[PDB]
């Protein structure tokens, strides 16, 4: 089922909050992980946590291309198996 952008945005924002370093207002629908304060190893954990949230398996090469809040939402919206 094609899941709409608004819900995907809410759930990705919900996942991004759990990092302690990230401050709850810095996360916006269009923000890169660097401005949020996330490191590379942190981005791994965020991509994985997105995998549990939407019940999908991110193939690794696409996982590298996810570096921003925006493109993660775009990838989740693109996926037809995203829940």
């Amino acid at each position: 089922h094609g899941l709409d952008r608004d819900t995907v945005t809410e759930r990705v924002i919900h996942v991004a909050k759990h990092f302690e370093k990230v401050d709850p207002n810095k996360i916006t629908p269009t923000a890169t992980f660097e401005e949020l304060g996330l490191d590379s190893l942190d981005t791994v954990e965020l991509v994985m946590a997105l995998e549990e949230e939407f019940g999908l398996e991110i193939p690794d090469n696409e996982a590298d291309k996810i570096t921003t809040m925006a493109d993660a939402i775009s990838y989740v919206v693109s996926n037809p198996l995203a829940k």
Binding site: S40, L41, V44, M48, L56, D60, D64, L81
Partner: protein, 120 residues
């Protein structure tokens, strides 16, 4: 390490090691409860060596971690069912449109259907 992992840049190579290690923690666990402490332990294992700048030592750590991740590949990867390597992948694949169906086949030139021997 595979060729595709080797061709990757350093930053992405360490990222791959962390991702594969986390997935193998998931595979070797008995439940979600085991996952969190082991995930924190892997976190600390990577954080310990992040500030090293000596290239040769870093190469040693990356190679050893790659050997460790190669040996502890699980016989049974935990994969979601709808994805490649999953149980329900391809059970009843959705059939596409634009199918070439020949209506009333036996009534197209019914008397003269058959094989002919053509000669010079």
């Amino acid at each position: 390490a595979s060729e595709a992992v080797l061709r990757l840049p350093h930053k992405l190579r360490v990222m791959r090691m962390y991702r594969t290690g986390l997935k193998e923690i998931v595979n070797w666990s008995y439940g979600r409860h085991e996952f969190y402490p082991r995930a924190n332990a892997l976190r600390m294992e990577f954080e310990a060596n992040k500030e090293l700048s000596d290239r040769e030592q870093i190469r040693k750590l990356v190679l050893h971690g790659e050997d460790l991740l190669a040996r502890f590949r699980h016989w049974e990867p935990t994969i979601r069912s709808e994805f490649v390597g999953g149980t329900v992948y391809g059970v009843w694949p959705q059939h596409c449109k634009d199918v070439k169906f020949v209506p009333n086949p036996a009534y197209i030139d019914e008397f003269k259907q058959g094989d002919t021997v053509l000669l010079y």
